[PDB]
Amino acid sequence: MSYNYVVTAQKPTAVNGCVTGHFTSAEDLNLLIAKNTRLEIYVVTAEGLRPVKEVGMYGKIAVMELFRPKGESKDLLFILTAKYNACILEYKQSGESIDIITRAHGNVQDRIGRPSETGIIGIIDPECRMIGLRLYDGLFKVIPLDRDNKELKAFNIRLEELHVIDVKFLYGCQAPTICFVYQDPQGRHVKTYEVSLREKEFNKGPWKQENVEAEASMVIAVPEPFGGAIIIGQESITYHNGDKYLAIAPPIIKQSTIVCHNRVDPNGSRYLLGDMEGRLFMLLLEKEEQMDGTVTLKDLRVELLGETSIAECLTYLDNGVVFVGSRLGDSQLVKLNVDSNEQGSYVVAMETFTNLGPIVDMCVVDLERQGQGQLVTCSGAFKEGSLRIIRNGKLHIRTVPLYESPRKICYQEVSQCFGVLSSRIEVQDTSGGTTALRPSASTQALSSSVSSSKLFSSSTAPHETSFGEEVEVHNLLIIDQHTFEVLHAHQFLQNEYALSLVSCKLGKDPNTYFIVGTAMVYPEEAEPKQGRIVVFQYSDGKLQTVAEKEVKGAVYSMVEFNGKLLASINSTVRLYEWTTEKELRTECNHYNNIMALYLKTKGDFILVGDLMRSVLLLAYKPMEGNFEEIARDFNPNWMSAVEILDDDNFLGAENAFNLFVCQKDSAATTDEERQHLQEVGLFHLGEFVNVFCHGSLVMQNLGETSTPTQGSVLFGTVNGMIGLVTSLSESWYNLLLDMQNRLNKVIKSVGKIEHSFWRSFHTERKTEPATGFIDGDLIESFLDISRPKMQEVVANLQYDDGSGMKREATADDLIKVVEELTRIH
Amino acid sequence: QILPPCRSIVRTLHQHKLGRASWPSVQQGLQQSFLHTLDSYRILQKAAPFDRRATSLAWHPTHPSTVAVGSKGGDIMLWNFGIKDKPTFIKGIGAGGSITGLKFNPLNTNQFYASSMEGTTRLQDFKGNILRVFASSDTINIWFCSLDVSASSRMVVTGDNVGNVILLNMDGKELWNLRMHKKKVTHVALNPCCDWFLATASVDQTVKIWDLRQVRGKASFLYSLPHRHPVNAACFSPDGARLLTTDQKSEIRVYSASQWDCPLGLIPHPHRHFQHLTPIKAAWHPRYNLIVVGRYPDPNFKSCTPYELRTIDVFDGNSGKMMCQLYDPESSGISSLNEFNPMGDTLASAMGYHILIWSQEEART
């Protein structure tokens, strides 16, 4: 009965993977980049990148590696999805038409299995004898690379080692051999196995197991003439090959974990290394000659190259140019010089590529013109953190670097500024408290303040802190709406995290306040036992503390409610009134919750999102001053966000990247039945939704009666994808669902993956087809297919143009429909 | 209360909102949180009696506060909390018609399947009307023992005291009743993520994994796992990848997908079997890797804990060790059965002549 339409407005920008090779031709140097559903293919130039192609796959690209079997003139591409769709692809170009043809596809999902902690791993042997996949503990999946393996059939080998840290195929082995690091009660160790296809089993590797560093975390399989493997840990770097053993402990690497690596020279003589702080290092291999003409590794040395965005992945292209693919910050093209500049860095940025992710919060404001909404998003993470300001007229994006992590944002019209919660990282100083690693918005504000509310220190205890523990220091920033200058910074207490923020008017008081909810953080607490509501007033460029209220828990969420303040603290919902003396005073409480993370409101109704118990509909009862439980979503769901479509329709998002829509049971004849919401809509989005918000980007044609869509809810994602959800009537839903089926019979799916499988509701507990949701991306895909195939899509399709009698639909009719639909975002 | 290394909940939650930290780390922390709050279930909420002993228990899957229970004397009760409308009852012969298996109908929640000592696998309503008998012994001193159902496959299955299992459709159509074991079968269960391989447990010191579509040839089974003692239950997880099994002397085992034969781990715990006592059945928690079981002390068992009372023990699945202990005086009976709701906020216990509800704390304004 709830019918909705969902569409992408800005595709994801975060980089999930990157590889180099020779994909489009043996002579071409290609770069492939994976952003979570999108694959971008560029040509490497001396100066940078020429875009050649961008495709969407009906799947989350989890593995992406290029390989070149014997007898092939150019490389093929293997991709694996999170739903375990494996496929081998070939590049085909003819004229200006480029198409990726499906050479092989198959579903490698097991009938049963638990996904592993360190996630999916996929590797391809250097000699293209087999593909290896780590999906489940205790198993190693092998897809033999036979020419006949067009279904990508596979076999399982038991792996005795259940907690695998990393694994790679070795080079220079005359049979396929894997080398992998695993964890057991004895610590972390490195081991090898040969892979026997004809026995479908492991055989003993060529050299024995070794104990490795306790935080040994990455394996690199070294090519000839060196051969062997390098193991990268947090405190040590080792190389092992048979009787060869060499370890180094450079102090430089202690400050941040190396998390990505890349081979510079095809013979392995140099690597680039990136750490969690975005530092970029060179790793250099010294050769040792031998009388027999082989070459072994003599020594390893590391030299700091410079600083980048925190890199998820790196690929050296050519000519000292490196592509830095980031999910946490903007991706980059950088140039490597042999000699340093004045400050000693060898890195110079060439090009920056936008990253909207992570989108942790956002709001819509008519900054410049009435009715012309612009989006302001809390973007990024640590020193790469930013605000992003997005406006139509495709889109113009202004970036405001903050150098720290935003959490929430709201707009305060009467002061013409924004309030933003943020957090920076500090470490212990030489003798004193803590120090920040660089300047940032909270440390570069026009004015500054310090706390004095000593209600926090109730039975404080001294805790011994080892040298250099990092801490999150939280602040509230006041930001100019026009210049985005840091107007003010208010620092919260030490070890106190600010989690929620609202700007609102309360009671009969005409003043507007900034309201912040916090929690005191100790390491050993499973949940918070203390927190604050803090009411500030902004005037004369500063925050003034207006009021405080101490509670025994974390204030997850707050919202203004008919001049009152509703708040959720761990398993409780409390309602406070704002007194003439400027204090919060409790009206009523509700207790039946596990963990109330998410709140939204409409009228007197409240939608509560639980950590693990999907969603709940409460009502405030004004004629008794307490709550009545209206209904509950009795399906468990690990929520990430909720939203109210309207009085009757309730939106939720879950950890398995699905959305759902619930309604009251209209056909209920008893209170017990009336209390059950029914999950009437389901849809696999494929993204992690953190935030919904009301608003729209497209200019509203005020009084635009008779459009297909009703309502407008934008949402932001970790990958920087921005989407819109809206409501639909029944007839349009029926029309567009029939369109989906007809289109899905026409569109060529890369890897021959069925669209229904892709968009199917899927968890480790249940798999169900989608319902109640239209895939706006699928509808939009109508406009790029050829006209005869458009006529095929509408062949034998009954269509009602406007208001009237039904008739045969023409291609132009549906072009007009989809074009009208494109203007909603 | 006593818990191992873990910290920084709000940090981990935000890291998940950033994509840095993976979901299962958060799931681990929140499993820890659920156990932490479970240490505050100590205030026993509710107790409920009726006539002759309780033998089997089942949860209304969709609804949290409703539950069905079946007695030693063929007495069924259906009970909701916070209603106070004098719960629903149906009586039986009262002496030798002990129902011993009970799961709800996923279709008509006011119905239920049942297996009886009378020798009548039936499907019957809570109003009293017998909808349909499914099988029959047709000779006394031969009765049914086990029962389960699946909706995605639309199958019903049930086990005997002699060694043979029956498999029907919801509308009859019996193509089964070949013998599986030589003696009584205590429990049987279907997979949730797939639909067509099965698990069965028996008094034969063996637990068996079947392929209900492929095997037809009188012990051309798929897998057979041995034991040191008989088994009272072998129940799948909801995820489907970890199989739990429980003995009669002192043992629990966790088997994986990978090599059903060999075990991952053994969870020793005493639940020693007895004639007049209701047999013990360990159980999963539907959405974590926890296990919840009732204890029945043996003075000869090597206790790890120095305090040995008639407690309800909770464990973590993939480790081996414990995390919490439920106890409440006024209820010093021994909770034979324990089952969490599929919902995840409530727990039912079956003690001798008593049904208990162990819900969380009610706070104060």
Side-chain angles (χ1 to χ4, degrees), chain A, chain B residues 2-5 8-365:
Chain A
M1 182 172 106
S2 202
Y3 308 107
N4 294 280
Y5 181 90
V6 180
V7 66
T8 304
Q10 169 58 55
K11 283 188 296 193
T13 55
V15 171
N16 306 112
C18 68
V19 299
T20 54
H22 312 285
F23 181 60
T24 58
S25 162
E27 296 75 25
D28 290 334
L29 179 62
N30 303 121
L31 174 57
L32 274 58
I33 310 177
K35 305 179 175 165
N36 186 49
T37 51
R38 317 305 302 186
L39 172 63
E40 303 177 347
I41 305 89
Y42 296 85
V43 168
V44 179
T45 79
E47 176 51 36
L49 299 171
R50 183 171 85 253
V52 184
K53 186 64 169 166
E54 188 270 320
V55 298
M57 290 192 65
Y58 289 166
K60 295 170 60 54
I61 296 166
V63 178
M64 179 183 65
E65 295 295 342
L66 287 167
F67 70 114
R68 192 184 303 181
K70 292 187 178 305
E72 296 294 330
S73 59
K74 59 190 188 292
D75 293 78
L76 297 178
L77 176 60
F78 179 65
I79 284 183
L80 187 59
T81 68
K83 286 185 166 181
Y84 310 100
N85 307 99
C87 61
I88 298 170
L89 302 174
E90 184 178 353
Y91 191 87
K92 284 290 184 240
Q93 180 172 162
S94 55
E96 183 43 51
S97 66
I98 294 161
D99 202 285
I100 303 305
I101 296 309
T102 291
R103 291 281 296 272
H105 77 281
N107 192 289
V108 301
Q109 194 172 27
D110 287 341
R111 285 168 289 184
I112 59 185
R114 308 197 67 86
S116 303
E117 53 239 42
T118 56
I120 293 169
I121 300 172
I123 49 169
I124 311 190
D125 204 39
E127 295 78 354
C128 301
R129 292 171 288 192
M130 56 178 61
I131 297 163
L133 305 173
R134 200 290 302 276
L135 307 179
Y136 315 100
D137 52 356
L139 293 165
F140 185 71
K141 184 171 291 244
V142 174
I143 307 165
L145 286 171
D146 195 349
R147 302 186 309 280
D148 212 328
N149 196 11
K150 297 190 184 202
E151 299 184 2
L152 300 178
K153 296 287 179 61
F155 64 92
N156 279 327
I157 308 173
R158 181 198 172 81
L159 179 44
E160 209 74 359
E161 291 77 27
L162 299 173
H163 309 298
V164 167
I165 308 295
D166 262 325
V167 56
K168 207 79 191 303
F169 281 111
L170 296 181
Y171 292 92
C173 301
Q174 301 86 79
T177 302
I178 58 169
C179 176
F180 61 100
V181 169
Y182 69 102
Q183 173 74 68
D184 73 330
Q186 288 77 336
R188 284 189 188 177
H189 322 272
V190 59
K191 183 174 188 183
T192 53
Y193 287 122
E194 179 272 357
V195 186
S196 173
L197 286 170
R198 308 286 65 78
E199 300 301 77
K200 299 182 190 289
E201 293 291 355
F202 292 135
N203 306 152
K204 190 172 217 180
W207 35 272
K208 62 184 175 71
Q209 180 180 300
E210 301 289 344
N211 300 336
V212 298
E213 199 208 330
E215 296 165 279
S217 63
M218 292 191 291
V219 175
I220 298 170
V222 184
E224 296 185 78
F226 298 106
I230 294 169
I231 306 307
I232 307 289
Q234 188 62 16
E235 314 167 336
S236 304
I237 300 172
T238 66
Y239 175 81
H240 300 270
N241 195 358
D243 299 316
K244 184 61 169 186
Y245 177 111
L246 200 158
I248 59 167
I252 189 70
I253 69 179
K254 193 179 312 311
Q255 78 101 20
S256 180
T257 303
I258 294 164
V259 293
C260 55
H261 55 79
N262 181 250
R263 190 173 61 214
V264 174
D265 298 321
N267 64 5
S269 295
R270 289 190 295 170
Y271 284 80
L272 258 64
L273 304 174
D275 67 4
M276 298 185 166
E277 293 285 0
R279 300 196 301 179
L280 188 64
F281 308 85
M282 192 193 275
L283 171 66
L284 194 140
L285 281 67
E286 183 177 7
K287 298 175 192 77
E288 38 178 356
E289 65 88 17
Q290 294 85 352
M291 282 301 319
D292 67 74
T294 316
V295 172
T296 317
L297 186 63
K298 190 172 167 178
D299 200 58
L300 286 172
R301 169 182 303 96
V302 173
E303 299 187 315
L304 178 149
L305 301 178
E307 185 177 0
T308 66
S309 296
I310 301 167
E312 181 66 10
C313 44
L314 292 168
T315 40
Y316 179 74
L317 304 184
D318 53 351
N319 305 306
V321 183
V322 179
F323 180 75
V324 174
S326 180
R327 70 182 167 88
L328 302 177
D330 293 334
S331 288
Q332 307 173 294
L333 286 171
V334 302
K335 177 162 280 172
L336 303 184
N337 298 315
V338 295
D339 191 7
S340 50
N341 299 10
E342 80 300 359
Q343 182 44 37
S345 177
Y346 299 85
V347 177
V348 174
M350 300 162 48
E351 191 168 359
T352 305
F353 307 93
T354 68
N355 178 24
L356 302 176
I359 295 168
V360 307
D361 196 16
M362 69 198 197
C363 286
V364 173
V365 176
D366 57 309
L367 282 169
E368 293 173 22
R369 289 290 298 277
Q370 187 275 324
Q372 185 193 23
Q374 303 194 27
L375 185 58
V376 185
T377 67
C378 293
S379 161
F382 309 101
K383 72 182 186 72
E384 314 303 338
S386 66
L387 307 181
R388 308 275 172 145
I389 303 90
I390 301 148
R391 66 154 170 84
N392 289 6
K394 286 294 300 304
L395 305 179
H396 184 269
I397 303 173
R398 181 170 175 186
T399 298
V400 177
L402 303 171
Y403 312 101
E404 60 188 358
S405 290
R407 301 287 177 84
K408 290 287 180 172
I409 187 165
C410 63
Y411 179 57
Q412 190 164 102
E413 185 170 12
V414 301
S415 301
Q416 299 285 276
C417 316
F418 294 91
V420 170
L421 296 179
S422 72
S423 61
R424 62 179 191 270
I425 295 285
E426 299 204 340
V427 302
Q428 192 83 50
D429 71 346
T430 54
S431 291
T434 61
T435 47
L437 307 179
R438 63 190 63 77
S440 63
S442 57
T443 74
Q444 297 173 127
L446 202 51
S447 63
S448 307
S449 57
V450 181
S451 166
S452 57
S453 192
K454 308 306 193 306
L455 58 80
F456 72 101
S457 60
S458 68
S459 85
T460 307
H463 59 105
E464 170 46 34
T465 47
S466 302
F467 179 49
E469 286 170 343
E470 314 194 319
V471 307
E472 297 193 348
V473 178
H474 292 232
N475 278 260
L476 172 52
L477 301 176
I478 307 189
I479 298 97
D480 188 84
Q481 77 173 69
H482 304 296
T483 65
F484 296 88
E485 187 180 6
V486 188
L487 303 171
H488 188 83
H490 175 84
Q491 189 173 119
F492 291 94
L493 297 163
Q494 186 167 287
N495 310 126
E496 186 174 36
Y497 285 22
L499 307 182
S500 52
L501 175 69
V502 194
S503 171
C504 63
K505 300 187 68 129
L506 296 175
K508 308 173 190 233
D509 186 347
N511 297 319
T512 309
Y513 299 123
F514 284 112
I515 306 178
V516 174
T518 74
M520 301 303 304
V521 174
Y522 298 103
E524 310 316 302
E525 291 190 352
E527 61 172 17
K529 302 295 198 260
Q530 34 170 14
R532 297 192 293 159
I533 299 169
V534 191
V535 179
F536 296 100
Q537 188 175 14
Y538 174 65
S539 183
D540 195 357
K542 330 186 298 311
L543 284 178
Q544 300 186 141
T545 300
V546 175
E548 311 180 17
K549 195 79 212 180
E550 198 185 355
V551 300
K552 283 191 284 291
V555 189
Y556 282 129
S557 187
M558 304 186 98
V559 66
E560 62 206 277
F561 181 75
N562 300 293
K564 304 172 180 174
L565 181 66
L566 188 70
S568 58
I569 298 136
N570 282 3
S571 59
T572 73
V573 175
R574 313 193 190 178
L575 185 56
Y576 291 103
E577 292 185 282
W578 186 236
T579 67
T580 49
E581 302 296 344
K582 299 183 181 183
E583 304 286 11
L584 290 169
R585 194 285 312 277
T586 184
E587 183 175 2
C588 49
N589 304 295
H590 176 263
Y591 303 93
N592 179 218
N593 311 277
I594 292 297
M595 187 187 288
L597 259 35
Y598 311 114
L599 297 172
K600 293 291 177 65
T601 73
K602 185 186 180 65
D604 306 340
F605 293 94
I606 301 154
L607 184 64
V608 183
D610 193 70
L611 176 65
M612 62 182 76
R613 303 173 63 183
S614 175
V615 297
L616 165 73
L617 181 65
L618 307 185
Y620 173 72
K621 304 287 282 186
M623 283 307 316
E624 299 85 350
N626 56 38
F627 296 121
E628 184 187 352
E629 285 196 13
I630 303 304
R632 186 179 304 251
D633 182 8
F634 291 93
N635 305 272
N637 296 115
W638 295 88
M639 303 305 297
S640 63
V642 305
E643 193 274 348
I644 297 163
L645 301 178
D646 58 29
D647 61 340
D648 306 315
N649 292 284
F650 318 104
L651 178 59
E654 194 260 299
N655 295 359
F657 320 114
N658 307 278
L659 297 175
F660 66 94
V661 171
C662 278
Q663 284 186 347
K664 283 174 158 87
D665 186 2
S666 300
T669 315
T670 64
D671 186 11
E672 185 165 66
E673 286 166 62
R674 279 182 275 274
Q675 282 169 19
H676 282 237
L677 297 174
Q678 304 298 304
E679 53 184 351
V680 190
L682 295 172
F683 182 80
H684 188 176
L685 177 58
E687 298 286 2
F688 193 106
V689 181
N690 284 328
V691 285
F692 295 107
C693 78
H694 284 271
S696 177
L697 305 191
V698 309
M699 180 62 76
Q700 295 300 282
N701 297 175
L702 175 48
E704 46 172 356
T705 56
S706 302
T707 198
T709 67
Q710 296 80 39
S712 50
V713 169
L714 290 170
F715 61 89
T717 73
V718 299
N719 291 321
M721 183 169 185
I722 301 165
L724 172 59
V725 182
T726 188
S727 298
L728 197 55
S729 197
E730 315 98 335
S731 62
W732 273 105
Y733 175 86
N734 295 328
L735 170 56
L736 299 174
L737 191 169
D738 304 314
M739 285 180 68
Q740 279 203 56
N741 292 117
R742 290 157 172 271
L743 284 158
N744 289 328
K745 294 294 184 200
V746 175
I747 289 169
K748 302 293 197 71
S749 66
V750 177
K752 293 180 169 180
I753 305 169
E754 171 48 75
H755 178 268
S756 173
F757 176 82
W758 158 237
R759 297 306 196 180
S760 286
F761 189 97
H762 178 71
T763 67
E764 298 165 7
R765 303 178 213 86
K766 53 186 286 188
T767 81
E768 187 200 328
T771 191
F773 270 87
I774 297 300
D775 187 353
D777 295 355
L778 177 57
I779 297 296
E780 182 187 85
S781 309
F782 171 81
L783 67 91
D784 66 4
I785 295 299
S786 72
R787 189 171 178 82
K789 292 184 187 307
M790 289 180 167
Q791 290 280 334
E792 290 175 29
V793 166
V794 310
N796 189 83
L797 176 57
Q798 289 289 300
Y799 166 68
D800 189 331
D801 207 309
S803 304
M805 176 50 213
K806 204 156 70 142
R807 57 169 184 79
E808 180 57 82
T810 310
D812 296 324
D813 290 322
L814 277 298
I815 291 168
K816 289 293 125 183
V817 165
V818 65
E819 283 271 345
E820 177 159 36
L821 288 164
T822 64
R823 292 184 94 187
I824 73 193
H825 65 91
Chain B
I2 293 299
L3 62 178
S8 288
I9 288 81
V10 316
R11 209 167 296 172
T12 47
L13 292 163
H14 180 59
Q15 291 284 310
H16 200 186
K17 292 190 80 185
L18 303 192
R20 297 275 305 152
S22 63
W23 157 243
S25 64
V26 177
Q27 197 174 319
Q28 296 151 14
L30 300 169
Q31 186 173 11
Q32 197 171 266
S33 169
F34 175 80
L35 297 168
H36 172 276
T37 288
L38 179 57
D39 293 320
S40 160
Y41 279 29
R42 310 296 177 85
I43 292 93
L44 182 67
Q45 199 71 22
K46 299 191 178 179
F50 72 108
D51 211 331
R52 290 279 208 70
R53 284 186 301 109
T55 52
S56 303
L57 183 64
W59 277 115
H60 183 157
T62 55
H63 195 281
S65 159
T66 56
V67 80
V69 68
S71 79
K72 185 66 176 65
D75 302 313
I76 319 305
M77 190 209 288
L78 182 70
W79 175 33
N80 197 344
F81 322 134
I83 308 302
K84 303 293 184 174
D85 74 311
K86 159 51 199 186
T88 301
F89 203 101
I90 175 59
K91 205 170 187 301
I93 57 166
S98 315
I99 306 300
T100 181
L102 182 66
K103 289 272 167 57
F104 272 74
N105 184 9
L107 280 70
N108 190 336
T109 199
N110 293 260
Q111 296 180 0
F112 58 95
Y113 293 74
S115 71
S116 183
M117 189 170 277
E118 299 176 356
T120 64
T121 54
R122 61 166 178 277
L123 170 55
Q124 178 185 345
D125 193 272
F126 290 100
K127 196 184 60 38
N129 171 275
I130 288 163
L131 196 171
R132 264 187 72 203
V133 307
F134 276 54
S136 174
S137 68
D138 86 83
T139 169
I140 56 169
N141 87 9
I142 291 153
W143 69 105
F144 309 112
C145 306
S146 280
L147 173 62
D148 203 285
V149 179
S150 170
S152 168
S153 201
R154 300 187 190 83
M155 304 291 186
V156 285
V157 70
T158 185
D160 273 298
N161 63 311
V162 291
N164 49 8
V165 175
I166 315 182
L167 194 161
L168 272 81
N169 206 271
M170 62 167 79
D171 61 336
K173 175 43 179 72
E174 55 274 21
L175 190 76
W176 215 240
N177 206 341
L178 287 100
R179 188 172 284 239
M180 292 194 162
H181 279 274
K182 292 74 59 174
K183 304 180 194 174
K184 170 166 64 170
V185 281
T186 42
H187 191 49
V188 294
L190 302 153
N191 51 12
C193 182
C194 281
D195 300 81
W196 41 261
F197 61 82
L198 169 63
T200 62
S202 75
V203 287
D204 303 69
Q205 314 183 0
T206 60
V207 64
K208 279 181 194 151
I209 318 303
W210 299 87
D211 190 339
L212 68 100
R213 65 183 185 183
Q214 194 172 30
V215 311
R216 305 289 175 79
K218 197 109 192 184
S220 296
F221 59 83
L222 199 70
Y223 276 83
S224 53
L225 309 76
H227 285 269
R228 287 178 170 89
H229 287 90
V231 287
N232 308 77
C235 198
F236 270 141
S237 184
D239 307 8
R242 293 279 179 271
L243 177 55
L244 181 73
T245 197
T246 161
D247 80 305
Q248 276 193 143
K249 173 56 173 174
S250 47
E251 214 181 325
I252 286 166
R253 315 188 188 171
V254 287
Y255 293 106
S256 170
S258 55
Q259 300 201 140
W260 303 113
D261 299 319
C262 178
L264 181 147
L266 76 177
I267 303 171
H269 168 71
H271 35 88
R272 170 251 301 285
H273 159 271
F274 172 71
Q275 187 181 346
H276 304 291
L277 178 62
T278 307
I280 283 155
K281 174 253 176 175
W284 290 102
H285 177 274
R287 286 155 45 68
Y288 296 133
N289 197 252
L290 298 176
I291 288 157
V292 64
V293 184
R295 190 174 268 264
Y296 177 51
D298 177 359
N300 302 15
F301 159 78
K302 60 113 181 171
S303 75
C304 179
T305 54
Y307 40 83
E308 288 97 310
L309 308 74
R310 274 76 169 289
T311 81
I312 280 166
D313 227 32
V314 174
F315 292 82
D316 185 304
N318 307 151
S319 69
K321 61 181 201 299
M322 60 173 61
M323 294 292 184
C324 169
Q325 302 190 16
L326 278 69
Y327 179 64
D328 174 68
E330 185 261 11
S331 299
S332 185
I334 288 151
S335 178
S336 184
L337 305 172
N338 221 344
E339 271 86 2
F340 281 111
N341 206 283
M343 184 65 171
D345 62 339
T346 48
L347 174 56
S349 284
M351 298 148 74
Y353 296 84
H354 278 328
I355 293 160
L356 278 199
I357 305 295
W358 285 82
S359 191
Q360 85 295 22
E361 175 261 26
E362 286 286 355
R364 321 306 214 165
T365 174

